[PDB]
Structure formats: structure tokens, C-alpha cells
């Protein structure tokens, strides 16, 4: 009935970034849109690497369904995966962490204010404290 197929084409073994980069065809009939997690699981099974080494992205489902096409990378070791993958794609796969940062607006506003303060400021803090205290 439902037999997903994963097949690869255009495999280019790129040892500069320590990986194999290829193009993935996923044949899903009578189903929608195989998951990236399951893609990584089965790609790791086939390529005998670790689900932490495999990474895929950019999957587009053809008009009418049953087949989606994407791009995939299989690094040589989880070490190189962590070395070269973008922070965002690691974050997606749960290998790295989401950093908390303020909005761009708060960041640029704090930057402008600190630009307006010279020195380390703590003598300024003491001076304004006592000028008010007078």
C-alpha cells in the first residue's frame, strides 16, 4: 500500500567540507510529505552514518503529490557536522542551542545609549548619585 522510497542522485563527494552532498527524491504516494526526521533516520540507515551527521533541507512537493525533491548532506563524522553546519540547521536538528537575544530594536538602542556613555561610567554613576543627594 504505502511504501515510501528514498533515492539519491547527483552524489558529489566533497571532502573539503568532509561530506557527501546529494539530491534526494522521496516517493510518497497516498501520503503527504514525509518528515525530515524520518528522512534523516532512513538516510542514516542507508549511508551507515549517524542521524547526527545527516542533514537535509529544502524539500518541495511536486504538483499533485506523491513525490518531493530536496537536497541532503551526510558528513563524515558528527564532529565535522558540528564544525561546518550552520547554527540554524543544527538548532533545527537539536544538535545546538537556541541563543536568546533581544530584538534588533532593543539591541541597536542599547548600542546608541552606550555610545553616548564614555569611560566605564561608574564614576559617572557616583557623581550623579551625589549631585542628586545634594
Amino acid at each position: 500500500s504505502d511504501a515510501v522510497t528514498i533515492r539519491t542522485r547527483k552524489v558529489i563527494s566533497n571532502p573539503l567540507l568532509a561530506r557527501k552532498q546529494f539530491v534526494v527524491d522521496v516517493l510518497h504516494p497516498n501520503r503527504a510529505n514525509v518528515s525530515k526526521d524520518e528522512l534523516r533516520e532512513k538516510l542514516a540507515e542507508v549511508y551507515k552514518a549517524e542521524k547526527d551527521a545527516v542533514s537535509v533541507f529544502g524539500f518541495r512537493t511536486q504538483f499533485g503529490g506523491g513525490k518531493s525533491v530536496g537536497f541532503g548532506l551526510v558528513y563524515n563524522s558528527v564532529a565535522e557536522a558540528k564544525k561546518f553546519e550552520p547554527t540554524y540547521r543544527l538548532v533545527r536538528y537539536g544538535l545546538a542551542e537556541k541563543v536568546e537575544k533581544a530584538s534588533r530594536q532593543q539591541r541597536k538602542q542599547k548600542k546608541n545609549r552606550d555610545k553616548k556613555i564614555f569611560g566605564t561610567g561608574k564614576r559617572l554613576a557616583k557623581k550623579v548619585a551625589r549631585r542628586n543627594a545634594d
Partner: protein
């Protein structure tokens, strides 16, 4: 600051708009081919006018002129693969003899109705847009699709249709649920 896309208008209103022979011409065409728009007729009319102007200029060139030979052979093979031109008329003269009915006969809805998957030209139009007719392996829901030769051999019902495949549509299984429930009660 980016490079601008190229667009282009695909039709052109004819010279003198209201002329009764052409009003009736469009009537016959729209009626027998299932169209809906003087705009669809003008689209084909514009394409063909461009084609025939190309062919005429090549004819006015000299025989064996390299430009004529290259461009003309290209045009002829394009039309032969579209299916407008028969094999045996691979000559720019028959290109000049083309017509709008040929292009409309190549449209997809006409080909469904002819091959028999539909009962009328409007039945066919509806099916196509209803997502029921897939060419080769690929569902098509554009009624203006210009099947080529081998493609017109390959048209069929889509493997997702209640007509050529999977479980019946929502109305049928809602009726089935209604009847099974009413039998249960």
C-alpha cells in the same frame, strides 16, 4: 536595484473590434471548442499571427540563406512536435497555411473530449480543472495545455481520482455514511 523580471502581454485586441463576421466567428469558435473568452481566442490569434509573420519573413529570404535555414527548421520542428503541423507538410508554406482551429484542436480540453474521457467539451473542461486528468504521470489542471503527440497518447485519469483510482469522493462517502447509519437505526 535588482535586475527586473521580463514580462509580456500574451494577446492583443484585433484591429477593428466590432465586425459582424468576426463576431460570429468568435461565436462558432467559442461554442464548438468550449472556450469562454474573446481573450482566449485573441491569445491564440496573437500566437499564430506572430508565427505566420515569422514564416513569411523567412520565405521572403533567399533559399539556402543560413538564417532562413536555421530559423525555419526550428519553427517547423516546433510546430510538428506541438502537433499542429503534419509530418508530411514540413514546409514553411504549410506553416503559412496554418489556422486558429488547429491550435484550439491541440488544447487539452479538446483532447480529453475527443479521446472520450468526457461527454462534452464542458464536461472535459470541468474535469481538467477538477484535478481528474493526468498527462503521463503528472496531474494537469490547466485547460489550455497544448498536448504534444506522445502526450496525447498518454492522457488518462489521475491515480488519485475517484474515477481512476482511490476511494470515492466526499459526496459519495457522505451518502454512504448516511445510508449505513440509517440502516443501523
Amino acid at each position: 536595484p535588482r535586475a527586473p523580471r521580463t514580462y509580456s502581454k500574451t494577446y492583443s485586441t484585433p484591429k477593428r473590434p466590432y465586425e459582424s463576421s468576426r463576431l460570429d466567428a468568435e461565436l462558432k469558435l467559442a461554442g464548438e471548442f468550449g472556450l469562454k473568452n474573446k481573450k482566449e481566442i485573441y491569445r491564440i490569434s496573437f500566437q499564430l499571427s506572430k508565427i505566420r509573420r515569422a514564416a513569411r519573413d523567412l520565405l521572403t529570404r533567399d533559399e539556402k540563406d543560413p538564417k532562413r535555414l536555421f530559423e525555419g527548421n526550428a519553427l517547423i520542428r516546433r510546430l510538428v512536435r506541438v502537433g499542429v503541423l503534419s509530418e508530411d507538410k514540413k514546409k514553411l508554406d504549410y506553416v503559412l497555411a496554418l489556422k486558429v482551429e488547429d491550435f484550439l484542436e491541440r488544447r487539452l480540453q479538446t483532447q480529453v473530449y475527443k479521446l472520450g474521457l468526457a461527454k462534452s467539451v464542458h464536461h472535459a473542461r470541468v474535469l481538467i480543472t477538477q484535478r481528474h486528468i493526468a498527462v503521463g504521470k503528472q496531474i494537469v489542471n490547466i485547460p489550455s495545455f497544448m498536448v504534444r503527440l506522445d502526450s496525447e497518447k498518454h492522457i488518462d485519469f489521475a491515480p488519485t481520482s475517484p474515477f481512476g483510482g482511490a476511494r470515492p469522493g466526499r459526496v459519495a462517502r457522505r451518502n454512504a455514511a448516511r445510508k449505513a447509519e440509517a440502516s443501523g437505526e
